[PDB]
Structures are given as structure tokens and as C-alpha cells.
Design a protein around this ligand. Structure first.
Ligand SMILES: Nc1ncnc2c1ncn2[C@@H]1O[C@H](CSCC[C@H](N)C(=O)O)[C@@H](O)[C@H]1O
Length: 494
């Protein structure tokens, strides 16, 4: 009963070797990270977030929906053909469907939960006033104007007369009025919201070039060229390896590091990133297991600074440790399709950034990773466009491979009407079993687990979680969801 230090718990098993198999692929075209480039990349995101909250206020009088910007970057990266690993650069369509609908949901007014009878009367009144105002101001068909005008006016006549209404009466009147005016207000504000989604995209596209022009200037300063070395590959099937970068890495600037109360602090030009001690030791193991261009491991500290700085600009949680042990012991799981160097359980995984995370075991973005065999676990971030692309990606891999392939996907029943991605997997021909983790009866690890305290690690899931076993025929023959296996799996959730 004597820990090495306070918080010296292990939340990973970096000894599990991979069973993921891929065709040997060439290096990624993304440039190796550099602290001077990430410093410019971080301050351009902070400007981009400020542009986003100025456009929503100046053009709609509303603040941006919470996490709508972060969700926007996930959606953009599903279709982005650009070369920046964080900001979108070449997307189709320009207007993001994710950012568009999240803004529309708070138009003409962001509805808030009401805790009193007069609060409901206020929200109903404020909505009616905002809906009528938005139609008169923005160009619309005289028909659409008249429908909103009268339907709003009817709500006002009822508010003056019927003073005996209750908290429930005001709520039902709002939903009806929201149903009637909803479609008409959307067409009037469509051009305005599309402008917000388009302006933010074009500003980011401009920021990407400002990042590349400084990144190329640093490479040319160190006499490094952006050319191919030897794309001649002997085509073969191999076990998965960390994503490699084509361009050689230049020598990194010096960074200063100190530890205070088992918390590691790394500094570069006044900017400091923090990480707890055991996760700092974890990154050291991942760096030794994965990095092959740093012979003396001399770029470790500056590359860790870039890693932590990248996930700071990025601003769910992980499965419990005892659950990952069960997935590996019962279903041979050895790979996380959605993870990061800070939350990964295995030393092989897919992450959002191949330039900063490849040095720590990442295989790059999941949609660019095409395994032909292996047992996988999938806990993707809540983003419908990414989730939908995921099951399409998984189904293609299960279709076109005679080797054992398995995907155990954890998706919450968060939304009152389920995401199409969850429904698509429920009807998949590779679905071998569907399991439901009851709400308030299973846990997750913190999303800030890399620096949060041990008392703040685990939290109860307030929603159900759907666990789906997507396996081809040979994968089902090897890692079948047998009753005895499903028995021990649910035993780890207790
Ligand atoms: N395009 C992408 N490909 C792979 N992983 C991605 C990704 N975009 C985001 N992610 C990562 O997916 C993670 C989802 S949280 C998952 C936690 C844990 N690895 C688990 O499986 O339970 C986030 O940390 C995020 O960084």
C-alpha cells in the first residue's frame, strides 16, 4: 500500500502487440511538427474562434452554440482534401452542414430551459418578437411574411386575453408557434447562416497558407526539401506501424521543462503546456515504441510540447481500464480506431493528427487507415458526419477482406432520435450482437484524463451506450460474441 507517487496509476497496456494488418503504405505528406509553427497555429485558431463568435453576434445576435466550432473541425476533416492537419483547407461543400444546423437551432433565439411560469411567458414572447422581426428585416416571399406575421400576432392576442394560463400552457403554445414559424424563418436566415459557415471556412483557408508559408520557410532555412525519396514499394501485407512523415524533420529549437508536484511543465517562448507525471512517463514509452527518426530521442521534449499544444487548440471520454482488458482478453482487441496519445490504451491506435501523434504510436486518422485484419474498438467523438463515414468505412473493410476482422463500436444513445450512424450499424449484415449499457449504470474515464486528478478520472454515463459487434465471417469465427464471452464483458461493467 505504497504508491510511487500520488496519482501513479496506469491506464494503458503498452505491451499488447497489434493484430491489425494493412497493405504497406507510403509516408504521409504532412510536415513534421515544429514549435514555431504550432505557436503560429495556436494563435490563428484563437483568432478563428474569435471570428466565429463575432460573426454569430454581428449577424444573428447570438453566441455560438457550445462546441459547435470544435464539432465543425471534426466534420470538415471528414471531407477535407487540404494539407493542414488541424484547420480545413479544401472541402466540398464549402458550407458545413454541421455548423449550419447548430446555428439554425438557435435562430431567431436560443431557447433556454424555463424554471417558472413567468419564465415560459418570457420565452414565448421573446420568440414571437424575434420571429416576426426576422421576417420583416430579411427578404422573404410576401406569402412567407404573412404566415409569420399573423401566426405571431395570434400568440400576442392570446397572451393579453388568457391571463389564467399555467407553466404548461405557455410551453405548448411555444412549441406550436415554433412549429409554424420554424420553416419560414429558416429560409429567410439561410443566406445569413450560410455566409457564416462560408466566411469561417475561407478565413481558415487563408490561415492554412499563412501556416504553410512559415512552415516552408523554416524547412528551406534548414536546407530541407519537399520531395519524394523512394516511392518504389514492394507490395506486401504487414502488421500496422505508426504513420510516417515523408519530409525529414529539421532540428528542433530548445525547450525548457520542470516538474512541480508530479506535474510536468514544458515551456517554449513563454508558452507552457502541462501534463501529469504518469502520462509524461507514458508518452516516453510511446515515443520509444514508435519513433524511428530520433535515434538518440533528442527531439522528444519539443515534440511533446507540440503534441500537448496541438490538443490545447482542439480543446468524449474513454472506456474504463477493466473494460479494455476484457475486450482484449475475450475478443482479442488490440487497437483503438479513435484515440490520442493522451487517452490511448494500446500502443497502436488512430488519432486526429498524424504529424504530432505518429511519433507516439498513432496510425493517423481512422478514415485513412484501411486494415485487412484485426480486432478493433471504436469510440468515436459525437459528430454525425464522422460517425456516418465511420460505419461506411468499416463496412467497406468488412466487405472486401477474407481475413478475420472485427469492430466493437461504442456509441451512446444520446440523441432522442438516434443518429443515422447508429441505425445503420443496427441493420448491418456484419452486426453479430448488439449490447446496451444502461444509463447511470456504467462509467467512462475523463476526457481531461492526462492532467486531471485520480478522484476526477471516472464519471457515470448519464445516457445509454450501444455496443455493436461488427464482424465478417472469419472475424466472427475467431472473436464471436458467445454468451460466455458476453457474460464476462458485462461483468467488467460492474
Ligand atoms: N479522424 C480521427 N481519426 C481517429 N481518431 C480521431 C479522429 N478525430 C478525433 N479522434 C479522436 O477520437 C477520440 C475519441 S474519445 C475516445 C477515447 C478512447 N480512445 C476510447 O476509445 O474509449 C478523441 O480523443 C479524438 O482525439
Amino acid at each position: 500500500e505504497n504508491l510511487y507517487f500520488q496519482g501513479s496509476h496506469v491506464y494503458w497496456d503498452l505491451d499488447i502487440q497489434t493484430n491489425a494488418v494493412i497493405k504497406h503504405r507510403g509516408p504521409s505528406e504532412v510536415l513534421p511538427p515544429h514549435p514555431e509553427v504550432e505557436l503560429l497555429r495556436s494563435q490563428l485558431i484563437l483568432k478563428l474562434r474569435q471570428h466565429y463568435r463575432e460573426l454569430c453576434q454581428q449577424r444573428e445576435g447570438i453566441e455560438p452554440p457550445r462546441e459547435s466550432f470544435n464539432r465543425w473541425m471534426l466534420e470538415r476533416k471528414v471531407v477535407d482534401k487540404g494539407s493542414d492537419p488541424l484547420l480545413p483547407s479544401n472541402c466540398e461543400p464549402v458550407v458545413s452542414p454541421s455548423m449550419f444546423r447548430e446555428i439554425m437551432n438557435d435562430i431567431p433565439i436560443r431557447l433556454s430551459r424555463i424554471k417558472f411560469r413567468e419564465e415560459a411567458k418570457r420565452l414565448l414572447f421573446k420568440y414571437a418578437e424575434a420571429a416576426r422581426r426576422l421576417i420583416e428585416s430579411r427578404s422573404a416571399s410576401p406569402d412567407s411574411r404573412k404566415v409569420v406575421k399573423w401566426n405571431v400576432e395570434d400568440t400576442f392576442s392570446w397572451l393579453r386575453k388568457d391571463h389564467s394560463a399555467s407553466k404548461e400552457d405557455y410551453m405548448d403554445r411555444l412549441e406550436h408557434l415554433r412549429r409554424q414559424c420554424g420553416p419560414h424563418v429558416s429560409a429567410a436566415a439561410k443566406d445569413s447562416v450560410e455566409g457564416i459557415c462560408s466566411k469561417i471556412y475561407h478565413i481558415s483557408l487563408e490561415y492554412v497558407k499563412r501556416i504553410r508559408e512559415k512552415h516552408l520557410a523554416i524547412l528551406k532555412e534548414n536546407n530541407i526539401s519537399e520531395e519524394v525519396e523512394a516511392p518504389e514499394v514492394e507490395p506486401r501485407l504487414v502488421y500496422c506501424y505508426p504513420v510516417r512523415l515523408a519530409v525529414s524533420a529539421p532540428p528542433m529549437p530548445s525547450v525548457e521543462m520542470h516538474m512541480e508536484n508530479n506535474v510536468v511543465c514544458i515551456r517554449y517562448k513563454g508558452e507552457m503546456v502541462k501534463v501529469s507525471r504518469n502520462y509524461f512517463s507514458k508518452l516516453w514509452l510511446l515515443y520509444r515504441y514508435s519513433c524511428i527518426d530520433d535515434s538518440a530521442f533528442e527531439r522528444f521534449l519539443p515534440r511533446v510540447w507540440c503534441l500537448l499544444r496541438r490538443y490545447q487548440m482542439m480543446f468524449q471520454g474513454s472506456l474504463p481500464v477493466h473494460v479494455f482488458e476484457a475486450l482484449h482478453r475475450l475478443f482479442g482487441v488490440s487497437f483503438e480506431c479513435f484515440a490520442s496519445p493522451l487517452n490511448c490504451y494500446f500502443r497502436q491506435y488512430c488519432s486526429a493528427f498524424p504529424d504530432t501523434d505518429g511519433y507516439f504510436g498513432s496510425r493517423g486518422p481512422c478514415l485513412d487507415f484501411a486494415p485487412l485484419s484485426g480486432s478493433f474498438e471504436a469510440n468515436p467523438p459525437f459528430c454525425e458526419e464522422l460517425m456516418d463515414a465511420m460505419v461506411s468505412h468499416f463496412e467497406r473493410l468488412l466487405e472486401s477482406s477474407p481475413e478475420p476482422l472485427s469492430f466493437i463500436v461504442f456509441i451512446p444513445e444520446w440523441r432522442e432520435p438516434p443518429t443515422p450512424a447508429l441505425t445503420r450499424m443496427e441493420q448491418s449484415r456484419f452486426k453479430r450482437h448488439q449490447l446496451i449499457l444502461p444509463a447511470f449504470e456504467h462509467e467512462y474515464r475523463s476526457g481531461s484524463q492526462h492532467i486531471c486528478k485520480k478522484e476526477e478520472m471516472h464519471y457515470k454515463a448519464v445516457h445509454n451506450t450501444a455496443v455493436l459487434f461488427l464482424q465478417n465471417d472469419p472475424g466472427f469465427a475467431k472473436w464471436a460474441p458467445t454468451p460466455e464471452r458476453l457474460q464476462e464483458l458485462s461483468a467488467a461493467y460492474r
